[PDB]
């Protein structure tokens, strides 16, 4: 959930970018199911989509 | 051994992207320590780039 802040923040951080909810809804997803349906590697992957 | 040969092979069936010799040598890094230094999706963070 702290590296989730972390993330983010990250997002946050990057005011010129416009990552619109619903991708802010799926990474919010995709760390939520970390180790039991997908690594971070496809957590990884959809950010640096 | 055989998942390297195997991984090139995957590699090499697209041999038309560029590869350089730091990302040949990262990738032969990452197979030979597994799992005793680095995790599998190294490679796979790697090749996705």
Known sequence: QRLEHQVFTWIEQHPK?????????????SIEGLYE???????????LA
């Open 37 to 47: 349906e997908n690594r971070y590697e496809q957590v990884r992957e959809k950010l």
């Open 17 to 29: 970018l416009i990552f619109s909810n619903e991708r802010r809804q799926e990474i919010a997803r």
